[PDB]
């Protein structure tokens, strides 16, 4: 029932359950109890919004706890990612669709309908609700701030609709640039450490290969043409050359 949110990157991106995509642990742990337990068209849309607000508020609360109650930009990014996944679930463009997520889809199918124009109505319901869903995710911050609410998080970056694979590459990039110093320092600190690094970097290449392939299928079917343009936007002075070297074990450090 929306558990305590395992530590950052305690489980790496899983590319094996769904073979065409790599799923982050955060998405697997996304709080969906009220959405799952959803078993007048305008009224039932409202009831959905209420349950989504409750799931979003818990999600935001747990993400704040995961960040040790520090209201910083690291927290905003996690709120940005979880909000987007809520939207892709609501809109139907969620790439996980596993287990409980299949229940929330069928519940959404019964609310908006199965016909072709239903998917456009779920996109319109999300657009008139997404701002309220984002605010719910920071309600725990509002409850714990002794004074007024300061908006260190920015609505525009969170509320803007991107493809899920786009945002997941942004998240994977931040995950990669954090795991890299921890790994290059675990080597500079030896046949096991190299057999461990080169088994870590293989996960990173296999992940990036599956994401960039999912990128191509999504893009074809914002200043971004290649999947590396996403990393240039999201990351601090990101050089694509060094990145392909690192993931191909060519970098002039390894």
């Amino acid at each position: 029932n929306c558990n305590y949110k395992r530590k950052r990157r305690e489980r790496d991106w899983d590319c094996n359950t769904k073979k065409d995509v790599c799923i982050p642990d955060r998405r697997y742990q996304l709080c969906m109890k009220e959405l799952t337990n959803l078993v007048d068209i305008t009224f039932r849309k409202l009831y959905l919004k209420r349950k989504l607000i409750y799931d979003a508020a818990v999600e935001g609360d747990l993400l704040l706890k995961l960040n040790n109650y520090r209201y910083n930009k690291d927290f905003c990014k996690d709120i940005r990612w979880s909000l987007g996944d809520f939207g892709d679930i609501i809109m139907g463009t969620d790439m996980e669709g596993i287990g409980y997520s299949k229940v929330v889809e069928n519940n959404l199918r019964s609310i908006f309908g199965t016909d072709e124009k239903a998917q456009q109505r779920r996109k319109q319901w999300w657009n008139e609700s997404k701002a309220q869903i984002w605010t719910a995710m920071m309600y725990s911050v509002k409850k714990r701030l002794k004074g007024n609410f300061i908006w260190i998080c920015k609505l525009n970056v969170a509320v803007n609709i991107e493809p899920q694979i786009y945002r997941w590459i942004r998240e994977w990039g931040r995950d990669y640039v954090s795991e890299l110093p921890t790994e290059v320092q675990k080597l500079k600190e030896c046949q096991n450490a190299c057999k461990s690094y080169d088994q870590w970097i293989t996960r990173k290449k296999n992940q990036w290969d599956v994401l960039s392939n999912k990128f191509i299928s999504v893009k074809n079917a914002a200043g971004i043409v290649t999947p590396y343009d996403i990393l240039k936007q999201e990351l601090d002075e990101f050089n694509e050359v060094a990145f392909e070297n690192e993931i191909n074990k060519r970098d002039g450090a390894y």
Partner: single-chain antibody
Framework: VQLQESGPGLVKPSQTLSLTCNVS??????????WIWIRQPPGKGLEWIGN???????YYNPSLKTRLIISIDTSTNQFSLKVTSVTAADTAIYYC??????????????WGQGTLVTVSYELTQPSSVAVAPGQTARIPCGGD??????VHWYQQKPGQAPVLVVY???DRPSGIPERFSGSNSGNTATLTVSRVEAGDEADYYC???????????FGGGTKLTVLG
């Protein structure tokens, strides 16, 4: 934004009571709000009656469901309450109020003037806190893991409708003095009134939102008496 009830004031027992809330300053034809009816027997606390959504849907207090009809008319900016087959236990002041649909924990603001009519989550707060002038009154509100919820506080002076003084556990509306503050930790939320003036003498209700059936839950109330 202003609400106001209008009703008979006296009703023959076996008949049906009819009330009407006229809202001004804002349009009722919007999904942004719940439209709620609250009644209060003389001397007792606050009882939730029912809500209505601008789409026409309405749900009621389960203990009175069979005798309640809440209707809305978007084209005249009003919603109405009807209590059928009334008894002596229905004598009460009836308030209409408004609650947001867009926040995690809705509160009721504003409230109607209130009209007297004559013929499962539980919040626990004490009946009375009594302090001398200038002292510090602390009104506790008990609930199982109440910190997981956002609790609000209303002040009701005698003969008047309740007035929101604290919401989201520590927020004060514009008109409220800073002496009123709010806390919420563990299983107890606390309204703290510092420098207790004589004008602070009123009943104080903590309120929480029931997330399973979407209606407000009130504590029993706490009378704050100033001993002089």
């Amino acid at each position: 934004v202003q609400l106001q009830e209008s009703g008979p004031g006296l009703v023959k027992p076996s008949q049906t009571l009819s009330l009407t809330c006229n809202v001004s300053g804002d349009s009722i034809n919007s999904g942004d709000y719940y439209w709620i009816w609250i009644r209060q027997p003389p001397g007792k606390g606050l009882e939730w009656i029912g809500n209505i959504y601008y789409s026409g849907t309405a749900y009621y207090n389960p203990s009175l469901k069979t005798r309640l009809i809440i209707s809305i008319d978007t084209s005249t900016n009003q919603f109405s309450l009807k209590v059928t087959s009334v008894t002596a236990a229905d004598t009460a002041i009836y308030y209409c109020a408004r609650a947001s649909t867009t926040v995690v924990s809705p509160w009721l603001d504003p409230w109607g003037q209130g009209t007297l009519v004559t013929v499962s989550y539980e919040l626990t707060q004490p009946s009375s806190v009594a302090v001398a002038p200038g002292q510090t009154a602390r009104i506790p509100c008990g609930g199982d893991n109440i910190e997981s919820k956002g609790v609000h506080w209303y002040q009701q002076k005698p003969g008047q409708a309740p007035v929101l003084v604290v919401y989201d556990d520590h927020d004060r509306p514009s008109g409220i003095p800073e002496r009123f503050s709010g806390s919420n930790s563990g299983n107890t939320a606390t309204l703290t009134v510092s420098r207790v003036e004589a004008g602070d003498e009123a009943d104080y209700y903590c309120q929480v939102w029931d997330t399973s059936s979407e209606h407000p839950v009130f504590g029993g109330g706490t009378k704050l008496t100033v001993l002089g």
